[PDB]
Every structure is written in structure tokens, then in C-alpha cells.
Amino acid sequence: QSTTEELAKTFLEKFNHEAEELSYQSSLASWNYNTNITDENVQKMNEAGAKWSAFYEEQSKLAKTYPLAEIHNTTVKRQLQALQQSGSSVLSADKSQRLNTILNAMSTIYSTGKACNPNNPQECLLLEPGLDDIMENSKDYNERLWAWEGWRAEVGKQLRPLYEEYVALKNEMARANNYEDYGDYWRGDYEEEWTDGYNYSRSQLIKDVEHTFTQIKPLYQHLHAYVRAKLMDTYPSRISPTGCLPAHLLGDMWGRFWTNLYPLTVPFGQKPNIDVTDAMVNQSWDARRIFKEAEKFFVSVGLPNMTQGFWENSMLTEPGDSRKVVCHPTAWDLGKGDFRIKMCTKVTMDDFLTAHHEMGHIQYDMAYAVQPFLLRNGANEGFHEAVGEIMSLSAATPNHLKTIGLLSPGFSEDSETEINFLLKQALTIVGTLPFTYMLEKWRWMVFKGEIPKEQWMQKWWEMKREIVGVVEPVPHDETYCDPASLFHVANDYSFIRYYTRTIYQFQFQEALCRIAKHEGPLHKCDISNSSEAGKKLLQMLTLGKSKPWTLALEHVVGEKKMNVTPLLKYFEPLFTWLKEQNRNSFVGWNTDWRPYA
């Protein structure tokens, strides 16, 4: 007779040539909605999405009729494993509907909640753009404090019981899916089997993330102490010299990034950063010119050119005629080929760099398109964005701004222009690693059970003060659900993808620089005009999820584990400068300090 693999291959050949069309239809519907917001477009998009989801659920149910123990070929085993994931199709219809309505309630109460302070009952604004502008631009203590506490009190207190019931239902779902809890379910994306030598357990990810964080602790401690020293200028009587940093004074609502904190701690305030905006408008550059330059940069390293359909179906410019387009920079893989970008491009430098990021997303998408449908994705949750980020890294180099003709050849990179750029980079890159690690660790410990529901806020600020070096401005009791104030926690999104990604990119770039024979510090590296590094990256990009992410990572960087040495080497000049200017200051944070007393 036949085997299980001979039947599973037949079942997956019928699933692919249906999922192809049924996902391309939904993608075309969502694209037509995003490029032109109407009322009937929403109806068409919902119809296509419902059809695709129903078909996918039916095929997922049909797939589990084959056990993986009787399957030996790993190329079919991985597709079967990706299709067998039932999600929430295992609970009873009652609980499967209760969880979905709880998710919808949590996701719609986050986008609708507002916050208003005393002294102005009419000053009652949403998170965006009301509280967003406040937490992103303001420099007043009380103005940031009231917005922070309002967004966490009039929105998180309404999410706490929903989050408790959601945690319970998700734990039930995960236990029914043969897991420990929902955190184990989330770590399941890093789980690796069916390959000896490159196997990776779901518990190994915790050890790796906890080990690579102990290495960044000195660099992050120096950066945090430098920021705290340069923040006592803008806040003379609001920050302790040996304590930690208040959570509402970090440049955004939660303190995820420290980028908006740049024009407060910049090393040399008299030297201007290399912004090419005026040089771009003076050269009559338009959006199509920006994307043609990005295509030039990508072809310079050996990656193929954008298809013709990219240059006629992508919304590179804003319509601005009658269509209320929601244009957030996003790269689109519309199923059968059809790679597009829906960015509202302007003539500036930020849209010059962010176009390279989206084009790198498109390049990663175009690479693994040769894989089977179920294997068309990144190796894990942190590869796509890493490929996207290394491209912007190599493009933002002054040696790149001088080659394309944007910058004048009669320009020299000062010994100080290297420190402002590196400081801003550490602000946007290094300042987010403790935040991500702490948030995901709290979520894992909550899902497992090391934190009872009576210590959810007790352990949250504990891990904050002990990991990221950030303290709450005012204490929060157990009714608060401060973690749910973040878009990813209230909308059920895994967060560790933003940690590992940050570690992979520097592993790539360094490697991609070694093949480029770049001699010098690892912040002036420019992989342009180097087909060797481009080919080495393309060898890994076309893999997709076909092979374990450990072997895919070992292809490029030579190492199998998650290595943070390239990241620490990237910020080595900044590390030395920070160690120098941290001579008469306290490096480290004492959790005993409280900004409320």
C-alpha cells in the first residue's frame, strides 16, 4: 500500500493550489481597501478574509488526521506541522467565541480609550495623537505625568479583568494544544526538531535570551547612566543621581524606545547631523527617485531588481484626491508574486532610509517565494525585520550618501559626527532591548504561573526596577494592568521578536562586513558595491522556514547560537566614550528610589 508521507504529500499538494488563490484574494481585497477606504471595500475585505480563514481552519482540521510520528521527510514534516496548529479551534464553541469577543473588546477599547486630567475637563484626548504628541515631544514633568497616568488608569483598569479572563482562556487553549501554557505556545516559534545538531528547545530560548542579556548589561548600564546624567539638566529636581529613570520621561508612552530623547542628551550640540533633506529637494528628487536610488543600492550588493509590477501597482506617492488612505509604511506580499509598498513617501531623509527598510522586506519576501506555500516566511519571528534593518544601516552611511551624489565629496566625517550618530543609534536600538526582554519575561512568568493574579502589578514594576532601570512615577495597585497599555499586549502579540531581531542584524552586518573586507570601526561599514556579502545573505534568504533557524543563522554568521558580540562591537567607540564620561558618576541604578515617596 502507501505510507503516511505518500498521503501527506498528496494532501499538501491539494492544500497549496487552493490556499494560493484563497490568500491572494484576501490580500488583493485588503490592498484595495488600504489604497482606497470606502464602505463596500470593507465588506469585500471581510468576505475574502472570512472565506480564507474558514478554508484554512477546515484544512487545519483535515491535516491532523496524519500523525507526524509516521512521517520521516522533514520537508513535508514542517509543512504538516505548520498546518496542524489548531489555534483556538480546540476549545468548545462557547469558549472559542468568548475568547474571540474578549479579544475584540480588548482590541477596540485600546483604540477608543481617551485620557483627561484635572484643571481642564475638556482636555480629554486619545492616545494618538493626543497623548502621543505629549509623550513624544513635551518636556514638562507634570504634562507627561498626567498623560502617562491617565492612559494607564482610564484604559488599563478597563483591561485588567479582560486580560485575566484572556490569560485563563489562552492557557486552556494552549494546554489543549499539548503545551504547558500560552507563553510556551508563543516560544513554540523557536522550537526546532527533526534535525540533529541544530535542535532548539522552547526552554533553550529562555536560557539564550537570559544569557545574551547579561552581556549587554554593562553597555546598557553605561548608556542608562549617561542618559540619567544628561537628563538631570532638563529635570534638575526630578531625577536621582544614583537611582533609575522615571517611566514617563523616556520619549514615548511606555519607554520602549529612547529615540525622541536625542535632543536632550546629544554629545555635541553644535555639530549638526547629516540630514540630506535640503540636498534632496535641491536636486529635484522625487519619491520615484528615492525608490530608484534604493533599488540601485540593493542591486549594488547583488540582490535583484524590483519587478515591473512594483513600479505600477505600489502606492509610492499619496493620492490626495478623494481617498482617505491609511498609509503606514508597509511592504506587501500579495500572494502570487505581487510585491508592493503602500508608503506615503515625502522628500526627506527619514523616508529615504525607511524606503530601504521596506525594500529589504520586499527582497526577503521575493527570496523565499520558491519555497512551498506553508514555508514562505522568515526563519523565525526576527529575521524579516533584521534584513530590513541592516539595509537601512548600510544606506545611512556617509560613505553611501557621498557615492550616490547626495552629499558633496568635499566633506569629512569628524571625530564627533561618529559619536552623535552612534549615540542616537544606541538610543533607538540598545534602549529597547531591556524593555523587550523584561516585558516578554513578565508575560512568560504570568502565563506559566510563577506570578499569581494578586502580584501582576507587583512583579511588573519589580522586574522594571531590576532589569530596565525604570521606576513608576506613582504606585499602581493590583487593579491596574500597565502592560496592557502597550499595543502588543492588549492586541495579543508576541514581543520577543523585537529582541532576537536586534541581535540578529548586528550578527548579519558584522558578518556581511567581514565578507566586504571593510577595515575600520563597525559603524562606518557600507556593504554597497559588494556582491559577495549580498550573495551570502541571499543564500540564507531563499531558505525561508524550510530549514531550522539555527542552521540558517549559521549559514551567514558561522555561529549557531544567538551571539551578541557583534552588537557590542558595533557600539565600541560609544562604549569607550561613555566609560570615559562616566568617571564622576554612578553607573547602575538602585531600585530603592521612588519618585513619589
Binding site: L7, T10, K14, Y24, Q25, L28, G309
Partner: protein, 195 residues
């Protein structure tokens, strides 16, 4: 003199699905294939056995023109000694294929907004095909041992799947009209010879 009906195969209005590819036999002609080879209206033009030359030197018995439509990345499957869905279950070319394959993008005529699903291909089969064999039988492909009773069910799939041709459709999955010419030569007065 002996004008050949090349308009009803290349300039045809409708083409047949690859699972039911349309074979047209032509004879008693003084043919001129340089009219199309030197037209730059094709994306793929590959001639195996005989050179892609002017070809004004060949006497033929008859010429088969097998026309069908596939997507882009499957045109490479229309080649001798190739494996895949189109080569194994839809259209077979023997390793002695004296002829050529012409293929041109048809994103304008065979794909419309919403999706053109008039083109089918055989996705499953019990075995491979003979040289130049057609398989139109719609018998349900039984994977295991349980009978399908004539309707789909457990491990029973339909042997035909429709092509999802859309207008955008990046060039890999874009529709492509493929005409494969095969000029046979056997014991005959060779009624089909060029100038």
C-alpha cells in the same frame, strides 16, 4: 502558393487549458517560422533537436502545434527531461523532441480583475503520461484504499485545479500562452517543406 494557417494557432481568440491542451495538425505547407522568430513578440523561444536557425531547409511530414496556457515559472517545465506537475501530469515531452517551445506573457488577454479561472490543470494522477498523451478523465484520484463512492471525501481529491490568473499577478504566476511545435518526419513524401 502554399500559405500556412498560422493565424488560427498563434492569433487565435481562445486557448485550451493545459490539462486539455489543443493540438492542431498542419500539413501541405511551405512554412516560414522566421516570420515569428524575428518578431520579438515572444518571451521564451527554445528549439530542441533542430537549431533555432532560419529553418528554411526542412521538409516535414506534418507539424503539430500544441497550444495551452500556464503560468510563468511552469514554462521551464516545457522542456525535454523535465519533471513537475505540467511535465508529469499535464504535458509530456519525450527526450527525442525535435521541435520548439514558444511562450509569451498574456497578462492582458487571459487575466481580468477578480480572477480568470477558465484554465485548468491536472494536479494528481496515478502515474505519468505517455509521450504526447492527453488525460481528460475526471475520475476522482483515490489516494489511499477507501473508495470515494464517486464524490470527494477522505483522501479523495479532484484531478483538476483551476488557474488563478489575475491582472496584477507578478511575472512568475502571470498567465503565459505556450505554443509547442513538433515537426514529425517519418516514411512520407515530406509534403511540408519550406522555401
Amino acid at each position: 502558393t502554399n500559405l500556412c494557417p498560422f493565424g488560427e494557432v498563434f492569433n487565435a481568440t481562445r486557448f485550451a487549458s493545459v490539462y486539455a491542451w489543443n493540438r492542431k495538425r498542419i500539413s501541405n505547407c511551405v512554412a516560414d517560422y522566421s516570420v515569428l522568430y524575428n518578431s520579438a513578440s515572444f518571451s521564451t523561444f527554445k528549439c530542441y533537436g533542430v537549431s533555432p536557425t532560419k529553418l528554411n531547409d526542412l521538409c516535414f511530414t506534418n507539424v503539430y502545434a500544441d497550444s495551452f496556457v500556464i503560468r510563468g515559472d511552469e514554462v521551464r517545465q516545457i522542456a525535454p527531461g523535465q519533471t513537475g506537475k505540467i511535465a508529469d501530469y499535464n504535458y509530456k515531452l519525450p527526450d527525442d523532441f525535435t521541435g520548439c517551445v514558444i511562450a509569451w506573457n498574456s497578462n492582458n488577454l487571459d487575466s481580468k480583475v477578480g480572477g480568470n479561472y477558465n484554465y485548468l490543470y491536472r494536479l494528481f494522477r496515478k502515474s505519468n503520461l505517455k509521450p504526447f498523451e492527453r488525460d481528460i478523465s475526471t475520475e476522482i484520484y483515490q489516494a489511499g484504499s477507501t473508495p470515494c463512492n464517486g464524490v470527494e471525501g477522505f483522501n479523495c481529491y479532484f484531478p483538476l485545479q483551476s488557474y488563478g490568473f489575475q491582472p496584477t499577478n507578478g511575472v512568475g504566476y502571470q498567465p503565459y500562452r505556450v505554443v509547442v511545435l513538433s515537426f514529425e518526419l517519418l516514411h512520407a513524401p515530406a509534403t511540408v517543406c519550406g522555401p
